[PDB]
Amino acid sequence: TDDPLLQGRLFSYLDTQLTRHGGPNFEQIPVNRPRKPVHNNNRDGFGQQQIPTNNWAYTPNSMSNGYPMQANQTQGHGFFTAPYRYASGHLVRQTSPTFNDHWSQPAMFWNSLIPAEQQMVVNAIVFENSKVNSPHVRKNVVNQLNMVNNN
Amino acid sequence: EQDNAGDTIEVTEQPIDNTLYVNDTGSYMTTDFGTPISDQTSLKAGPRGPTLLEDFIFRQKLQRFDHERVPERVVHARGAGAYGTFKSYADWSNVTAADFLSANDKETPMFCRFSTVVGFRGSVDTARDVHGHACRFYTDEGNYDIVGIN
Amino acid sequence: EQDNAGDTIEVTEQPIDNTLYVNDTGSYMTTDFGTPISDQTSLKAGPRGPTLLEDFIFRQKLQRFDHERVPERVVHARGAGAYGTFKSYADWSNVTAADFLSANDKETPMFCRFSTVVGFRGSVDTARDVHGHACRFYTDEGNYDIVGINFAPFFIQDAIQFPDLVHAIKPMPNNEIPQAATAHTSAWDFFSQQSTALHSALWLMSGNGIPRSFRHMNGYGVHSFRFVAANGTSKVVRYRWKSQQGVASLVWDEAQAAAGKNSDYHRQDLYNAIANGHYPKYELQAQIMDEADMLRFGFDLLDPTKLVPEEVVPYTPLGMMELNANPTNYFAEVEQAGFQPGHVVPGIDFTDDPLLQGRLFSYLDTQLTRHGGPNFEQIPVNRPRKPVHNNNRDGFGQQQIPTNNWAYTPNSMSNGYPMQANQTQGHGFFTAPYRYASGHLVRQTSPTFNDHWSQPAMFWNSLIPAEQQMVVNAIVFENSKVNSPHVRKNVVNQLNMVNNNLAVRVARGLGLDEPSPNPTYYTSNKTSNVGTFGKPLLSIEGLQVGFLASNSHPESIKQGQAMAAQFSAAGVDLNIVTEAYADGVNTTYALSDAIDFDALIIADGVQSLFASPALANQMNSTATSTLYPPARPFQILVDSFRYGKPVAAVGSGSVALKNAGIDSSRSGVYTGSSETTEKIAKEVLEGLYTFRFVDRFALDE
Amino acid sequence: EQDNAGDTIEVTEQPIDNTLYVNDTGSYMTTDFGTPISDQTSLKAGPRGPTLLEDFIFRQKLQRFDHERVPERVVHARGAGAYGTFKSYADWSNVTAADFLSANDKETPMFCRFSTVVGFRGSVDTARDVHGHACRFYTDEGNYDIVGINFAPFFIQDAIQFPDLVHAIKPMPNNEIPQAATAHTSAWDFFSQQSTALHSALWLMSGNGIPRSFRHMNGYGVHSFRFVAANGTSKVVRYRWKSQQGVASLVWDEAQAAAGKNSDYHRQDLYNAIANGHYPKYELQAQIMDEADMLRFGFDLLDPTKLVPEEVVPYTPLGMMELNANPTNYFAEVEQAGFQPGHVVPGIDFTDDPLLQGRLFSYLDTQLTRHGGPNFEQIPVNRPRKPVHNNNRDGFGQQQIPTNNWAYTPNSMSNGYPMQANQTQGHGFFTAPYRYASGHLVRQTSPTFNDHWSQPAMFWNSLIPAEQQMVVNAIVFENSKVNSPHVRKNVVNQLNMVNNNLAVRVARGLGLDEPSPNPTYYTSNKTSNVGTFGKPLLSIEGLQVGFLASNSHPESIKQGQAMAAQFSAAGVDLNIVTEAYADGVNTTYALSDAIDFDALIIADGVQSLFASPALANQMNSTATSTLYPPARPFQILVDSFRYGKPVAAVGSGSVALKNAGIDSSRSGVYTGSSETTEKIAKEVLEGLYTFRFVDRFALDE
Amino acid sequence: FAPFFIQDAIQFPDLVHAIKPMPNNEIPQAATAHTSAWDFFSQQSTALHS
Ligand code: HEM
Ligand code: HEM
Ligand code: HEM
Ligand SMILES: [Cl-]
Ligand SMILES: [Cl-]
Ligand SMILES: [Cl-]
C-alpha cells in the first residue's frame, strides 16, 4: 500500500544488505536462498560462488531459446502489482491531513490496560523522564501526555 | 562434548538448495530470492508517469548491475584461463614427498591463467610485456600453484 | 541543549594535521603513521636469511600496494578529466532559479570527465563507441552534474533495460571476448530485437562513433529536463554542449591504426592541449520548450530515442565553458570522481523520462561499489565548494568530526540548526509544483514511444554521401564480425524499415538478399549538426603537423624549423621527424605514424626516404635501414592521403607524392618550391580547418 | 624531472573545501553534494500516493543511514577513549633514542582507549574480563602505541594460538551464548588444556577482572620490548602504567547489579570525571633490564605468561600521563581509532616474544576489516601530527592529492625526495643492531617456557585472604556454569599444581573430590601491587556519595545540601536522593542503586523509608509508594554494606542501620548527631580512601 | 507492538539517531531513557502511541 513508512522500507532493506555482506551476493548465502534455483540475468559481483551457463544474459535475445522466460499475472506465476491501484495528484512533499490525529489512539491504548499495568506505564515514563536531563523536555512530554489522558 | 545434557548439541541440517552451475533451460525468470518476474518495464504512476520506489524488480536488477565490478589485479590484470590435466612421468619420492609427483602416470586436475603484467583489464594482448604463466595443481594434498612468467 | 549540566557538552577541538595536496620537497620518508623509514631492503635473519614477520616497514608498504586498486565504472571505465570554468551569458532567472545561471558573467568552477563506454579501464581510446561528456558545476547551491554523451539519442527507452543493453554490448561472458567493441553477435542481436536502438546505432556507425578527440565532439544531455523559476513555472529543456573547436572524426582503419600506435590518443590530446595553453571550449545551449510541447512535434519529449531538430526548436546559448587545468593526481581526482544525474540544484528538475528516472537510482547506488563505503562525496573532487551540513553520520572512511550532538529533526536541543531549506527559504531544492501524475500503477510502455524508425531515417538523410558510405562500411564490418546469419538478416530487415537504400547496400556488403522498399516510416527529412564530415572545424588550435625530414639531408631540418614560427602562432604543433634524434629533431620515423599528425609536409631533397614497399623488398638484409621498419616514410604518406588529411610537399618532395600516386591537382594537396614555404604553411593552415578531403572516399549509391 | 618539456609537470592546486570539525551554527541543511534541502517528507504522487524513485533526498539520507555501521573489533569491541598529554620526567637518551623521552618536561599529545575483551559492542561494562589500556603518543617521530591490558601476564605464549583462546572464550558458535563471559565449558576447557593460561586466569578471577573503573586499574605492556640508544646499545624493558588514583575493584554480585543498572558504568565514569575536571593520571614506568637478563631470573623474558617481580627489578618512573579531554564524536574518533603494537618509533624495538611477534602482523591486517580499505591511517585520530611523505598510493577512500609524480625509489626525477631515513640520518627507525638469531627453522616451543604453574602460585600468595576467597568464589561460580564435569575436574587438577589449598576450596565449591598436595611447582613467594583489595586509593577525586533523604522530611534535603561544599572541595560528587525531583534533589530512589555510590549517608529523620522487604510485604496494594519498588531504600543500604562500602548515618539515620543489622561499631560505619555533620563528612572522606572494608567478607581456609 | 512511531520512512534516521546512544560519548546503551529520545517523542507526537 501507499503507507509512506512501508514505501521507504522497500528501498532501505535492499540497500542495507550491502553494508553487512560486503557485496551484492547476499541472497546467495544459504539462509537467504529460495528453495528452488534462481534464474535471471544478474551477474558477477564480489563473492560469486555460482557459475552461469547462459552466455546470452540479456532480454530480448534470439540466442537463448527464450530462457529464462518472462513471468507475469497470466503465465509463470509472475509477481504483479494489484491492477486496480491508482494514483492521482501533484508531485508533493506533503503529509496527508488524514494523518493528523496523534493522540486519540494513545488514549484508547491507555484505557486498554489493567490498573496495575497503567501504574507500570506511569513508573516507566517517570523513570525514563527522570533520566532525561532536560527540564524543558520533561515538560514537553507532560504536555503531550495531557493531550492523551489527563490522569 | 556429551558428558552432560548442556554441551550436547542437536544438529538439524536444513534441505537448502546447493546449485553450482546454473542451467536456465525450461525456466521462468525469478528474483535472487526466487519470486517469478518480468524485467522489461518499470512500474510507473500511469504509462507516462514517474517510476515508483516500490518497484523492487527494477531495484534488485540495477543493484546487481551497479555492483558487478570488482578491483582488477594490481599487476597481471589482463589475462585468460583454461582447465587441464597434468601427468607425472614417474614416482619422484626419492627427491620429493609431493603427492602429485608420487607415481608414474598419476594425473592431477589443473587450472592456469596467462596474462601480461602492466596493462589494466582491457589493455591490448600484444603489448610488449612480461607474460604470466600461473598454474594450479588441484592435488590430493592441497592446491599447489606455480606462479611463473615467460 | 543547555538548560541543565548533563546535556551541556564541552567541545575540545584537537590540533589534527589537515593536509590536502601532499608536498614532498625537503622531506624524509615516513610510514603512514609518521615514523621515519627507509624502504629499500627487507629485514632478514642474516644477509642471506629469511625475511622476518616483524618487518613492519615491508608489510605496511606492500599492504598499501596490495590494496591500490578499486572497481572500475561498470560503464565508461576508460576516461580522462580536467578542471575549468563556466561563465553565464545572462541572468536566466526568468526561466530558471538556478544560481550558477543567475547573472551575466557569473563564473562557476567546473570538473569534467570524457570517456568511451564499453571498454574496461585500459582499453584503446579510438574504439568505436559512445563517448561520455560529464561535467560538474561547483555551484554556490550544490554540485550540478550534466552527465551526457556525444550522441543526441540513446538506445533504450526504460532504465530497467540498461543491464540488457550493457551485457549485450560488453564482451561475451564465457571468454570475455571481444574488448571495447559492438562487433559481435550479442550486440547486434540486441540492437535488432530491441529496435529502439536503431537511432543510436546509426550514430555509432557514423563518424560520431570515432571522434578525432574529446575537443572535437559535442555533448548532449539526451533527456528532457526542467528549468524551474522561483515562482514555480517550468520549461522543458534539452542540453547541447556545442564544441567551439568544431566536430571532426576519424575513418575506421585510421581508428584501428591509432588503437595500435597510441592507445592514449584522446587522453594525450586533452592533456597536451591544456598543458600547451590551448584550452578547449564548449558553449552550453538549451532548447527551451513549453510544457504544452510534450507531444506537439509528433514524438514524445519523454522519449530519449528522439532528438528535437534544431530546425523545429533552436538551441538557446546559455554560457561558455572552458577547461584550463589538468588534474594533479589521476587516481585521486579522475578515477574517484563520481558524477550523478541526480546531482541537481534548485531551479533544475526532472521529467518522467523512464530512462532518466532509473539513472537517478543507479548512480547513487553504484558509488558504493567503487569507493568501498558511503562517504564517496567526502572525496575532494566530489566535495561541494561550501561546507556540508546535515544529520547523515558515520560509515567507513569518515574523515570529518561532527560537533552537533543532536543529529535528528525535529529536536529542541540544536537551536534549529541545520535549518530546513525549501522553495521559499534557504534556496532549498523543490520539485516543479505543476508536475502531476494520474493513472493505474502500470508496467506498460507508452504508445507515444512506438516509432523506432522515423528518426533513424532523418539521421541517415543528415549525413553527406561520404559519411553515409562510412555508416554502411561500419555496419557491414560489424555484422561480418557477428557470427550469426539470422542476426545479420534481422539487422538488414530492421535497417530496411529505416531506409531501403541503406539496407540494400548493407545486405550487399554482407552477401545477403536485397530487401524491397518498406515505406511506412520513410522520410526525406533531415537535420543539421549531426554529422562529422563535410563541415570544417571552427579552431585548429592544438592540432599536429608532421614535417618529414632526414638527417642525411641536414638542410631539411632547417627547412622544417623555419616553418615552426607560423604554426606556433596558430597554436599548431610542428613536429620535425627524422631517423634519429639530432639538433632540431622532434620525433622519429620509428615512433611515427599517420595518426600522429593532422597534416603532413614532405621536405625538399628527401625524396629517397619514400621508397615504396616494392622497392624496399629488392635490396633486403644488408644496407636496408635498421632505424625504422621498411617503407615507414612512404606508409606515413600513403596512410595520411588515404585518411583524407591535408598533405603538402616542398621542392623535390613532390617526387614522394608522385611515388604515392598522389596528383598535385587533388584537393588538400599543396606543393611549392623551397622559396614559397611561407605560402605552403598557410595552405596547410587552410587544409587543417577543412580537416578532411572527402573527395578521396569511395562512394556507392 | 625537468631536463625536457615532456616530463615537466604543471601543478594547479584547486581551492577545495577542507573542513575537519563540522559546525552547524547558522546553516541550512544540504545534501552531501551541497544542495540545500528539507528532509521531513517523502515526494509522492499525490499526498496519499506512492513514494517516487526520483526522490533523491529520501535516497541519499537513507543510503547514508543504511551504511552507518562498520565491523566492531574482533576483540576489545566494547571500549571508550579520551585525549590527554604525557610529560617526560627526564632526558632518557642514555637508554633510548625515543624522541618523546628526550627531555625533562617534554610534552607529547595522547589518545587512549580502554575496553573489555570478550563482549561485543554494546555488552555490559562490568563484565568479568581482561581490560585494555591502549595509548598513542603522537610524537614528532611518529605515532607510538602502547597496547596493553590491566593484567601483568597473558594467557598464551604464541600468537598462532590467539584464535583458539578467543574462540574458546567468545560465545558458543551454534547459538552465540553466553555474552561477555568466560563462564562456559569452552573457556575453562581451553584454560585447563592449555595450562599456560593459569596465571592470567587467576588474575581474571581476582578483583582485577572487575575493576571499579578505568581510572582505578593499572596498565601493563605485558611483553618485553627494547629501548635502543642512538649508538645501538639496547635494554630489555617491561612497561607498567601506575594509576595515580590507585587500584580498586568490585565484588562479583555488585558487578552483576551494575551490569543491569548501568551497562555504561565505566565509560560514564571516565566521561564524567574528565567533564568535571577530575583528570585521571597514570605514571609511565619501565623495568629496565640488561640483555644478559633474558634467562637470569629463572624464567624467560620472552615469555608473556611471566611477570618480573618488582622486588627483583624495580619499575623506573619515566613520566606522567594525564587524560584531560573527551572526544568530540565517538564514532569518528573512538570507534575508528586503530591501535597497533607495530606502531613503533625510533629508539623502540621488539623482542622475539612469539606472542608479540604475531600481534605485529595481526593488527595491521585487521585494520582493513574495520575501515573497508587501506587508508585507515588517514582517519584524523590515526594521523601523525606531522605530514606523511612516502610512495604509498591510491586505495579506497583516498582523500589526499599526491603531487610527487615519480613515486618510486631509486629515481633521478624527484630531487631525492622523500629521503631515506635510518639510524644515522633523518631519525629513521632501526632494528637494534646487536640482535641476533641462530637456529634451524623450527615450529617448536622453547623449553624455557615450560613452567606454567609457579607464577600462578606466586600470584595466589600475593592476595589478601578476602581476595583469595573472591578468586575461589569466581572459579566456583564459573566452573558451576561450565556444563561439563570432566572439564571441572581438569580445572581442579590444574589448580592443584598451583596451590593445594586453592584447589581443595574450589573442589569443595564444585562438589568434587578434594585433591592432595602436588608440590613440584609450589612456592611461598609473593609480589606486591597485583591485588585489588587491602590497599587504599591514592585519590578519591570523581568518586560518588549518595545522600539518602526524603521529600516528606524537607530538612533532610537541606542537611544533604550543607554537606555538599565539603565533598565538592575533595572533588567528590554528593548526590541527594529522594522519591522525586524537587528543589535541591539530584536523583531519585527509582533511578538509584548501591552501585551508583562509593559511600552512602542516611539523613536525620528519614528512618521510615528504610522498611525491610518483610515490612513492605504486609501492607501491599493501597498506600504502598508507587514512586519506587518496595524496600528500594533499604536495599540500597543493605547492598552498600554487603559490598564493603563506607556507610554513615546522621541522627535517627542510625535507626535505619539497626534495621539493616549494621552495628555502629563496624569498621567503615560512621554515626553522629545532626550537629556533627562536618565530622561525619570527613570520616566518609576517610572511608572513601580505604574504599572497601574487607572485614565484611566471609572467609574460609 | 501494533503501531509504529513515525508516519514517513524519511524520518527513520531521525527516530533512530534520537533513541540510539548520544554521538559524543555513545551513552546510554540499549535505552530510550535519555534526553534525545524523549525530545523526539515529544516534538514528533506521532510517536505517542508506540
Ligand atoms: C619471480 C617474480 C614474480 C613472478 C614470476 C610473478 C608472477 C605473477 C603472476 C603470474 C601473476 C598473475 C597470477 C594470475 O594470473 O592471476 C602475479 C600477480 C601478482 N603478483 Fe607477482 N610475480 C613475481 C614477483 C612479485 C613480487 C615480488 C610481488 C610482491 C611482493 C608480486 C605481487 C603480485 C600481486 C600482488 C599480484 C596480484 C595477484 C592477485 O591479485 O591475485 N609479484 N604475479
Ligand atoms: C541518456 C542516457 C545516458 C547518458 C547520457 C549516460 C551518461 C553516462 C556517463 C557520461 C557516464 C560516465 C560518467 C563519468 O565520466 O564518470 C556514465 C556512467 C554510468 N552510467 Fe550512464 N548514461 C546514460 C544511461 C544510463 C542508464 C539508463 C543507466 C542505468 C540505469 C546508467 C548507469 C550508469 C552507471 C552505473 C555508470 C557508472 C557511474 C559511476 O560508477 O560513477 N546510465 N553514464
Ligand atoms: C600481551 C597480549 C596482548 C595485549 C596486551 C593486547 C592488547 C589489546 C588491546 C588493548 C586491544 C584494543 C585496542 C583498542 O582499544 O582499540 C586489542 C585489540 C586487538 N588485539 Fe590484542 N592484545 C594482546 C594479544 C593479542 C594477540 C596475540 C593477538 C593476535 C595475534 C591480538 C590481536 C588483536 C586484534 C586483532 C585486535 C583488534 C584491533 C583492532 O581492530 O583495531 N592481540 N589488543
Ligand atoms: Cl494504497
Ligand atoms: Cl514529465
Ligand atoms: Cl629477543
SS (H, E, C) C235-300: EEEEEEEEECCCCCECCHHHHHHHHHHCCCHHHHHHHHHHHCCCCCEEEEEEEEECHHHCCCCCCC
- With a 6 A CB cut-off, is D132 part of the ligand 3 pocket? yes
Whether C360 and D56 have beta carbons less than 8 Å apart is answered as: yes
C-alpha span between C56 and C54 (Å, rounded): 6
Q: Please state whether C369 falls in left (phi above 0), alpha (psi between -120 and 50) or beta.
A: alpha
Map grid coordinates 613515486 to a residue.
D407
Angstrom distances, CA of residue D193 to CA of C7, D156, D688: 50, 12, 42
Whether C240 and C220 have beta carbons less than 8 Å apart is answered as: yes
Report the catalytic residues of B: 76
C-alpha span between A6 and E26 (Å, rounded): 29
Whether C404 and E35 have beta carbons less than 8 Å apart is answered as: no
Kindly report the number of other CB atoms within 10 A of residue D160's CB atom: 12
Distance from CA of D369 to the nearest CA of B (A): 17
Q: What's the grid cell of residue B42?
A: 518499470
Q: From the CA of D297, how far away is ligand 6's center (Å)?
A: 16
Note if the bond before C629 is cis, omega within 30 degrees. no
Q: Is the dihedral of CA D180, D182, D183, D184 positive or negative?
A: positive
Q: From the CA of D52, how far away is ligand 5's center (Å)?
A: 13
C-alpha span between A103 and A108 (Å, rounded): 9
- On the CB side of D669, CA atoms within 13 Å amount to 22
Q: From the CA of B70, how far away is ligand 1's center (Å)?
A: 18
Round to the nearest angstrom and report the end-to-end CA distance of chain E.
Answer: 7
* β-strands D348-349, D316-325 pairing: unpaired
C-alpha span between D161 and C96 (Å, rounded): 67
Map grid coordinates 565530622 to a residue.
D679
Q: Which of C194, D612, C654, A11 is nearest to B59 (CA)?
A: A11
Residue D545: in which H helix or E strand, if any? strand D544-548
**Type of residue at A100:** N
Note if the bond before D178 is cis, omega within 30 degrees. yes
* Buried/exposed D16-52: b ≥16 CB within 10 Å, e otherwise: eeebebbebeebbbbbbbbbbbbbbbbbbbbbbbbbb
- Residue A86, annotated as binding a ligand: no
C-alpha span between B123 and C180 (Å, rounded): 10
Q: What is the CA radius of gyration of chain E?
A: 11
Note if the bond before A68 is cis, omega within 30 degrees. yes
Non-local CB neighbours of D130 within 8 Å, separated by 6+ positions: D116, D117, D118, D149, D150, D151, D200, D204, D209
* Buried/exposed C566-604: b ≥16 CB within 10 Å, e otherwise: bbeebebbbbbbbbeeeeebbbbbeebbbbbbbbbbbbb
Whether D376 and C32 have beta carbons less than 8 Å apart is answered as: no
**Per DSSP, what are the bridge partners of residue D323?**
D84
C-alpha span between C361 and C355 (Å, rounded): 11
CA angle D102, D108, D109 (to 5 degrees): 165
Q: Please state whether C449 falls in left (phi above 0), alpha (psi between -120 and 50) or beta.
A: alpha
CA angle B5, B6, B10 (to 5 degrees): 75
C520 burial (CB, 10 Å; 0-12 / 13-18 / 19+) is: exposed
Q: What is the largest CA-CA distance in chain C?
A: 100
- On the CB side of C538, CA atoms within 13 Å amount to 15
- With a 6 A CB cut-off, is D366 part of the ligand 3 pocket? yes
Non-local CB neighbours of C686 within 8 Å, separated by 6+ positions: C646
Whether B22 and A50 have beta carbons less than 8 Å apart is answered as: yes
- Tell me the residue ranges of DSSP E strands in C364-505: 401-402, 436-442
C-alpha span between C358 and E28 (Å, rounded): 41
C-alpha span between D527 and D183 (Å, rounded): 28
Kindly report the number of other CB atoms within 10 A of residue C402's CB atom: 23
Note if the bond before C171 is cis, omega within 30 degrees. no
Angstrom distances, CA of residue A114 to CA of A119, C159, D621: 9, 56, 14
Q: Is the dihedral of CA A12, A14, A15, A18 positive or negative?
A: positive
Whether C16 and D380 have beta carbons less than 8 Å apart is answered as: yes
For chain C, the residues whose C-beta falls within 8 A of a C-beta of chain A are: 3-7, 161, 163-165, 167-168, 172-174, 185-186, 189-190, 193-194, 365, 368, 412-413, 431-443, 484, 486-487, 490
Whether D320 and D283 have beta carbons less than 8 Å apart is answered as: yes
C-alpha span between D672 and D603 (Å, rounded): 11
Length of chain B: 150
Q: Who among B46, B61, B78 is closest to C437 (CB)?
A: B46
- On the CB side of D210, CA atoms within 13 Å amount to 25
Tell me, in Å, the resolution of the deposited structure: 1.8
**Type of residue at D272:** N
Whether C86 and C137 have beta carbons less than 8 Å apart is answered as: yes
The chain E residue lying nearest A126, using CA atoms, is E33
Ligand nearest to the CA of D294: 6
C-alpha span between C217 and C204 (Å, rounded): 13
CA D567 to chain centre: 27
Three-state secondary structure call for residue C681: helix
Whether D193 and D495 have beta carbons less than 8 Å apart is answered as: no
C-alpha span between A15 and D59 (Å, rounded): 10
Angstrom distances, CA of residue D469 to CA of C557, D181, D463, D472, D519: 100, 20, 9, 5, 22
C-alpha span between C218 and C208 (Å, rounded): 9
**Type of residue at D443:** R
C-alpha span between D188 and D197 (Å, rounded): 10
C-alpha span between C472 and D333 (Å, rounded): 63
B26 burial (CB, 10 Å; 0-12 / 13-18 / 19+) is: exposed
Q: Is the dihedral of CA C620, C621, C625, C626 positive or negative?
A: positive
Q: Please state whether A91 falls in left (phi above 0), alpha (psi between -120 and 50) or beta.
A: beta
The yes-or-no answer on residue C76 being catalytic is yes
Non-local CB neighbours of D32 within 8 Å, separated by 6+ positions: C377, C378, C388, C390, C392, D60, D64
- Tell me the residue ranges of DSSP E strands in D1-131: 21-22, 44-45, 79-88, 107-115
The dihedrals phi and psi of D657, each to the nearest 5 degrees, come to: -60, -50
Note if the bond before B36 is cis, omega within 30 degrees. no
- Tell me the residue ranges of DSSP E strands in C61-185: 79-88, 107-115, 132-139, 142-149
Which of D3, D16, D20, D33 is the mutation pick for testing C, counting most C CBs within 10 A? Answer: D33
Q: Which of C273, C274, C204, C215 is nearest to C246 (CA)?
A: C215
Residue D274: in which H helix or E strand, if any? helix D265-275
Whether B76 and B94 have beta carbons less than 8 Å apart is answered as: no
Angstrom distances, CA of residue C179 to CA of A42, C169, C261: 21, 10, 17
Atom of ligand 1 nearest to the CA of B148: 5
Round to the nearest angstrom and report the end-to-end CA distance of chain D.
Answer: 81
Q: Which of C542, C21, C189 is nearest to D12 (CA)?
A: C21
B6/D483 CB distance under 8 A: yes
Three-state secondary structure call for residue C169: helix
- With a 6 A CB cut-off, is B75 part of the ligand 1 pocket? yes
Whether C413 and E34 have beta carbons less than 8 Å apart is answered as: no
Three-state secondary structure call for residue D515: coil
C-alpha span between D138 and D85 (Å, rounded): 9
Whether C496 and C515 have beta carbons less than 8 Å apart is answered as: yes
Map grid coordinates 533512530 to a residue.
E16
Whether D619 and D666 have beta carbons less than 8 Å apart is answered as: no
**Type of residue at D390:** N
**Type of residue at D464:** I
Q: From the CA of D416, how far away is ligand 1's center (Å)?
A: 28
- On the CB side of B87, CA atoms within 13 Å amount to 3
DSSP 3-state percent helix, strand, coil across chain E (nearest 5): 50, 0, 50
Residues in E closer than 8 angstroms to D80, CB to CB, are 25-26
Q: What is the CA radius of gyration of chain D?
A: 29
Residues in E closer than 8 angstroms to D267, CB to CB, are 25-27
Name the residue with the closest Cα to ligand 3, atom 24: D359
C-alpha span between D304 and D306 (Å, rounded): 5
Q: Which of C191, C123, C189 is nearest to C155 (CA)?
A: C191
Q: From the CA of A26, how far away is ligand 1's center (Å)?
A: 30
Query: What number of helices (H) and strands (E) belong to chain C?
Result: 17, 19
Q: Which of D114, D216, D207 is nearest to D689 (CA)?
A: D216
Name the residue with the closest Cα to ligand 3, atom 25: D359
Ligand 2 environment, Cβ below 6 A: B 62, 66; C 73-76, 79, 113, 115, 132, 134, 147-149, 154, 159, 162, 222-223, 304, 337-339, 355, 358-359, 362-363, 366, 370
Helix H segments across D605-676? 613-618, 632-643, 653-659
Three-state secondary structure call for residue D425: strand
C-alpha span between D584 and D547 (Å, rounded): 12
Whether C399 and D379 have beta carbons less than 8 Å apart is answered as: yes
C-alpha span between D494 and C255 (Å, rounded): 80
- Method used to obtain the model: X-ray
Round to the nearest angstrom and report the end-to-end CA distance of chain A.
Answer: 37
E28/D329 CB distance under 8 A: no
C-alpha span between B31 and B36 (Å, rounded): 6
CA D253 to chain centre: 20
Whether A53 and B21 have beta carbons less than 8 Å apart is answered as: yes
Kindly state the DSSP code that residue D694 receives in the 8-state scheme. G
Chains with ≥3 Cβ pairs under 8 A against E? A, C, D
* β-strands D544-548, D573-578 pairing: parallel
Name the residue with the closest Cα to ligand 1, atom 33: B75
Q: What's the grid cell of residue C281?
A: 571550449
* Buried/exposed D542-553: b ≥16 CB within 10 Å, e otherwise: bbbbbbbbbbeb
Q: Which of C184, D121, D519, E33 is nearest to A132 (CA)?
A: E33
Kindly report the number of other CB atoms within 10 A of residue D533's CB atom: 23
C-alpha span between C273 and C265 (Å, rounded): 12
